[PDB]
Design a protein around this nucleic acid. Sequence first.
DNA 1: ACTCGCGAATATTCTAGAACGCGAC
DNA 2: GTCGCGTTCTAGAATATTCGCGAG
Lengths: 95, 94, 95
Amino acid sequence: PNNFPAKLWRLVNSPRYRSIRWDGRGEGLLIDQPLFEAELLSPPELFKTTSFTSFIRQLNLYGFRKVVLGPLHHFHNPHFRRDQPQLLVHLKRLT
Amino acid sequence: NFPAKLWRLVNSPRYRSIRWDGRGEGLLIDQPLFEAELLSPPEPELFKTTSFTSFIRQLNLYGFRKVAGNGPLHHFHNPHFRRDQPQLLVHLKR
Amino acid sequence: PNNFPAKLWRLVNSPRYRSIRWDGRGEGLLIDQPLFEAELLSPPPELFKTTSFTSFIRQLNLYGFRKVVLPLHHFHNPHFRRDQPQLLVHLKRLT
DNA sequence: ACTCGCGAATATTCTAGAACGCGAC
DNA sequence: GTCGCGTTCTAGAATATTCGCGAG
């Protein structure tokens, strides 16, 4: 089972999780690290880690990278897109 | 006997801790209530084990897969364990 | 908080953690499961990340602990003995 | 500097292999 | 007497987390 991509989709898409959201084009995600730490690592639900760096490690394992051009983090994956949810099936850890 | 016991348990409102999910395609188990009323002292349906992990082993052995009172809500599902299609129960094998 | 063998040694030897202790001969450990869940699995300095006693059992077996052949659990490992800490070096994960 | 992003060890999660006793034939 | 079942204990394998750090 590939649970992490579906969980990430739920977090990004849901307006409860304000700290992690779609970017303006729906082709990447924006993360406000202080709010993320407060609402998703401190108290879809609830990661086991309290360390934002462990969450970044997961993003990287599933192929997310930072976008190159508020101190928001901006990540992207070709198979993580608002207008093409059917691509989510390709998100996997390497084996 | 286990498929029939599971069917009776999920369908019976007397046993609160194990029930159909919201869409009727899987079962929800409240572990504290299940242990309190179904594996240790609460016609009753009586398991012989007192350990929830052995019940989980039974669920897995018959092909169930993992997919709000106080504690861990477990959510299991099996394509052959179905509210509106009981005739599929014959396909359950250990 | 250090590797599982060192952590377990700390837990078993320290009287602060009442739920996990040496047996009468110092050749196995006794675990009171309700108390262990309350004091070593229930978040509010030695806390495991899991909240599940079954995951702790998985760790015990992974490092070679077995139940003593005749809740209060009694486990033993030939390399985990009160009067021989030098044996701890032989404990390995079965991987 | 300082950040990005991966290697590898450990922990956790979920499921299964196999032994053994018992109940239903 | 004989199997199938239920149970128990331990383990396989995938994921999640942790720790560390090389490259730019």
